[PDB]
Design a protein around this ligand. Sequence first.
Ligand SMILES: Nc1nc2c(ncn2[C@@H]2O[C@H](COP(=O)(O)OP(=O)(O)OP(=O)(O)OP(=O)(O)OP(=O)(O)OC[C@H]3O[C@@H](n4cnc5c(N)ncnc54)[C@H](O)[C@@H]3O)[C@@H](O)[C@H]2O)c(=O)[nH]1
Ligand SMILES: Nc1nc2c(ncn2[C@@H]2O[C@H](COP(=O)(O)OP(=O)(O)OP(=O)(O)OP(=O)(O)OP(=O)(O)OC[C@H]3O[C@@H](n4cnc5c(N)ncnc54)[C@H](O)[C@@H]3O)[C@@H](O)[C@H]2O)c(=O)[nH]1
Ligand SMILES: Nc1nc2c(ncn2[C@@H]2O[C@H](COP(=O)(O)OP(=O)(O)O)[C@@H](O)[C@H]2O)c(=O)[nH]1
Lengths: 432, 64, 45, 119, 65
Amino acid sequence: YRDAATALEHLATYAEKDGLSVEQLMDSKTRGGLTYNDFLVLPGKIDFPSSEVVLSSRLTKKITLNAPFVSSPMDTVTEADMAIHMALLGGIGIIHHNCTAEEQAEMVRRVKKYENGFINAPVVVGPDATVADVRRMKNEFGFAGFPVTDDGKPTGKLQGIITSRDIQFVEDETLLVSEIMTKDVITGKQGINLEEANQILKNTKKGKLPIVDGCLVSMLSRTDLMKNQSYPLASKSADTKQLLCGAAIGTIDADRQRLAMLVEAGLDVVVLDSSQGNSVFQINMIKWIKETFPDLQVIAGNVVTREQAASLIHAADGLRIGMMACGRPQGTAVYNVTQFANQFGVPCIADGGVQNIGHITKAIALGASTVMMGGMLAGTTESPGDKGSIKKYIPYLYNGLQHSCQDIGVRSLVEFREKVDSGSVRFEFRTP
Amino acid sequence: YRDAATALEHLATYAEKDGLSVEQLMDSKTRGGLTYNDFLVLPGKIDFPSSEVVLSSRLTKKIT
Amino acid sequence: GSIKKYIPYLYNGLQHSCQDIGVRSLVEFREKVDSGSVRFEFRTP
Amino acid sequence: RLAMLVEAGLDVVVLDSSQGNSVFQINMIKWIKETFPDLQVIAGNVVTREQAASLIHAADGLRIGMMACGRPQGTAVYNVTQFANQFGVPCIADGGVQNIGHITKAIALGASTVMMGGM
Amino acid sequence: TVADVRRMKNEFGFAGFPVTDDGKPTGKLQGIITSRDIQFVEDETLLVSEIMTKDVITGKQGINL
Ligand SMILES: Nc1nc2c(ncn2[C@@H]2O[C@H](COP(=O)(O)OP(=O)(O)OP(=O)(O)OP(=O)(O)OP(=O)(O)OC[C@H]3O[C@@H](n4cnc5c(N)ncnc54)[C@H](O)[C@@H]3O)[C@@H](O)[C@H]2O)c(=O)[nH]1
Ligand SMILES: Nc1nc2c(ncn2[C@@H]2O[C@H](COP(=O)(O)OP(=O)(O)OP(=O)(O)OP(=O)(O)OP(=O)(O)OC[C@H]3O[C@@H](n4cnc5c(N)ncnc54)[C@H](O)[C@@H]3O)[C@@H](O)[C@H]2O)c(=O)[nH]1
Ligand SMILES: Nc1nc2c(ncn2[C@@H]2O[C@H](COP(=O)(O)OP(=O)(O)O)[C@@H](O)[C@H]2O)c(=O)[nH]1
């Protein structure tokens, strides 16, 4: 028999590495169209803990996410609650367009204002406002920390602040806010930095830090600091410290106005929702959105072929992949589209057919940047209307992906993409 | 990364179009006998409404 | 149900499938498929 | 834990890992050989040729068998066993064995012994 | 230590702990420490006395509920 010390040396003797390369596995001529279940990714070398794995994924060319998890823009999956929690857990949610423009615009607004660094146009109450009116406002707005202004206007002179603790055990509901409102409120001078303002609030050990000019400009909340502390992988705007929000719109002329209202609500990413996205209408819309709203990131699709991706890219911040009579197997569609699309630096979303961690790992291995979940997320508490809360569930998927990455021998999604493309990562076709 | 304006130009770089031709798909020697459920037709370019589609079919040489 | 409702449904459905494919007529579809313009993918079980 | 087991007259030690191609298991194999030389060490689980080479370079025997990450057992046993058999390292075919036919097929593919746990 | 108070909160489930000189429930009251006090404390090695509220509002014994 051969010596044990010659194993690595003898290993080089073989013409090719054990298993199949991505190019060999994804052969339309020999193996045909494939799905996630049709193949497996072979294990490599484990020299790092699963903890060290980085799951940062690029949703668009200008947008990067901590976890590559995207909520589908479906009536039964993504709403204001689902979008907020998905962003909070290092993922983003696309709001469903199966509603009026006003209704959809409000949902984007709610997600944008759930967490803030500097509160803009903060809700304020009049000095003559009744205690009952403040209680009526809390259920309506969902928050009870309202500063008091002389004219009842957001930019009015600041006369004090009223909170939940102030009216919590008030026997008389007919009393004015002025009598029940805190007389002296700790505030920060206008022009102060967010870090400097946060320091003043931390020392003060108070719930709110209104910012004045002595008129009211913006307000800081202790709660936001707690939200940031509790969720450190949350997907939010670095400049505003607000959760990133995505919405789904049509390719019709009527959606041009609907998009305007959504953009006005602070919408960060727009996804063009089409079964077949390779149309003149969607191509014309992409150009219109770029000219009309340049700062907005546009995700174009759905595209299942290389030609479709080229056309949408020539117009597209990101690409949505996934499509009875007309369509393509998801595994084959992701690799072919992603192979061409990846060259131009366009991140691609693998949409549909994702029910487990294995599907997520396989989809990314095939060249996908992020994966869209719509059947899995459905039945969660955060979903409109049982798999439990996404708070517990999203952390589970994130941990699972790290372990699968460790078994493969890749410390990051970026390394995984490079190793698979380099042929280092090996695959095996699975028989029925 | 490659420029976005070079996508269509770069598209011609590939030896053959994405997907299989009818001749390639209908191979008795390699894929064997096939049925309707066994294959799918890939989407192309949509520059017309569905309304404009004409479904006129020839039942016989003299009947349409 | 009645074929009056059902036949119109099949006719509309065929038009949509033709639109997704990128062919404006059955004649064009036949020519494009024969020309190799139309592409197909084998489906695994 | 191994020291106490060795003290009890333990003959063969199997390193229990879903993926056995790690620095920790590689370091453990060397530690066990230096600390308890008489003990026979079975390393794994390995489903690929590269994994087997790494564990062999460290392994008295190899344990073969591994959703998102894994390999079909028939393909894994032949590929691992083909390389491993050259160095005189007996390989155990672990998992998927429910009948005599599986046992016969596993050995035919180059496996030395078969592991039974559901049966 | 501030860390000990944090360790106590998970163990007891509440963080509103008054401070006594001898550390006994019936000891002289020197102040009270709560969740808001240690919520954003960068240094975990600090004593409770420095981070504990200096003046605490209390009720005389024999007072009705
Ligand atoms: N509020 C608000 N939030 C928005 C808005 N838009 C978005 N949001 C978001 O919604 C979230 C608000 O959540 P929250 O602040 O936890 O809920 P809330 O209902 O606003 O809090 P409250 O119950 O009012 O606090 P509570 O009165 O219980 O303690 P505290 O304020 O310390 O009270 C303790 C005592 O100290 C006094 N006090 C409080 N602050 C004071 C100050 N600066 N100076 C002097 N005194 C002060 C008070 O009067 C009170 O009696 C934030 O994440 C925020 O970003 C908006 O328009 N308004
Ligand atoms: N605590 C406790 N609970 C038990 C025990 N056994 C059973 N329980 C039960 O457990 C429950 C306790 O729940 P809880 O009180 O809501 O939770 P907790 O962790 O104790 O509250 P905390 O977060 O400490 O309040 P927090 O500090 O956020 O606000 P506050 O105390 O106003 O802080 C605001 C600021 O004001 C200062 N402050 C607070 N009180 C002060 C006072 N009297 N005088 C002067 N200053 C005061 C504080 O230092 C803080 O900075 C109660 O139902 C209680 O009956 C026990 O042994 N201990
Ligand atoms: N008011 C407020 N401040 C925030 C928020 N998120 C972060 N900060 C500030 O940012 C600092 C911590 O930065 P870090 O958490 O690393 O930034 P992140 O990566 O955006 O979460 C703290 O000093 C906070 O004052 C927020 O949602 N609201």
